[PDB]
Design a binder for this molecule. Structure first.
Ligand SMILES: COc1ccc(F)cc1C(=O)NCc1ccc(-c2nn([C@@H](C)C(F)(F)F)c(N)c2C(N)=O)cc1
Length: 264
């Protein structure tokens, strides 16, 4: 799990975010990697380092691989698979100019495969959204930052009443009782399908976070994006049953997605 910084070559800065600056580089001069230089005070570093091996064991082709950490310096670096097309949210917005609707369903299938694998390990993502998915050079969407919110220090992001909490991707039991489960990741997956079919629009854009929480509690749900067929909308809507036990599993969503692919 411990990578020697001597083996990294830094080649270009890709951007920055909540948890630090990201650079593209090579490991041992040969293998592409992305390197995130963790923002001081943003994460519970000792706890993340001890459990970096846990996340490194989650190996599925549709999960962005965590390769290791560099911890013998400040700041700590997190080394991952390089995703040349960057975050899915921005990539959807760029796609508006040139795309086939069948590509949208393939993106949903990629994320659903990763989530079925996490579900099989009873591993909660806790913040599934287009901004936490990445896209590689071949247009494959993969899920990233799985389980990271448990190590975030800022309560504005982790608390269900924090200004920065992902309210628009949360079911009623998370907003009210902070009750996370595989079924809250299912709800967020339905919102992510809506983000894909809306080419990166913000969910519930006319409403504030507090209004959105009330809207959801009243049973109101996102509309069908015009690119989604009624069969696709039925799948995303199935993620939004008020009762968590009524929502499907990722194995069921994957089969439904594969049925629509085989039919349309
Ligand atoms: C799989 O990783 C994890 C799994 C579990 C967990 F709990 C935490 C992590 C984690 O912290 N990973 C560190 C990391 C995260 C995202 C990028 C990245 N970001 N971006 C862009 C948006 C940008 F703009 F930031 F560069 C890429 N293209 C990136 C790229 N990989 O090409 C790089 C490294």
């Amino acid at each position: 799990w411990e990578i020697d910084p001597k083996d990294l070559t830094f080649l270009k800065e890709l951007g920055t975010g909540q948890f630090g600056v990201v650079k593209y580089g090579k490991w041992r001069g040969q293998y592409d990697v992305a390197i995130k230089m963790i923002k001081e005070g943003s994460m519970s570093e000792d706890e993340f380092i001890e459990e970096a091996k846990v996340m490194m064991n989650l190996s599925h082709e549709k999960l962005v691989q965590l390769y290791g950490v560099c911890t013998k310096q400040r700041p700590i670096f997190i080394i991952t698979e390089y995703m040349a097309n960057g975050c899915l949210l921005n990539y959807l917005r760029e796609m508006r100019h040139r795309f086939q609707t069948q590509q949208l369903l393939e993106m949903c299938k990629d994320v659903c495969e990763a989530m079925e694998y996490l579900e099989s390990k009873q591993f909660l993502h806790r913040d599934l959204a287009a901004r936490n998915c990445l896209v590689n050079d071949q247009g494959v969407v993969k899920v990233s930052d799985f389980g990271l919110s448990r190590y975030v220090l800022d309560d504005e992001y982790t608390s269900s009443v924090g200004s920065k909490f992902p309210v628009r991707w949360s079911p009623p039991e998370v907003l009210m009782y902070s009750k996370f489960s595989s079924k809250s990741d299912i709800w967020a997956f339905g919102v992510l399908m809506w983000e894909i079919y809306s080419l990166g629009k913000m969910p519930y854009e006319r409403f504030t976070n507090s209004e959105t929480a009330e809207h959801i509690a009243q049973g109101l749900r996102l509309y069908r994006p015009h690119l989604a067929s009624e069969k696709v909308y039925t799948i995303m809507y199935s993620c939004w049953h008020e009762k968590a036990d009524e929502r499907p599993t990722f194995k069921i969503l994957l089969s439904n997605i594969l049925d629509v692919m085989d039919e349309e």
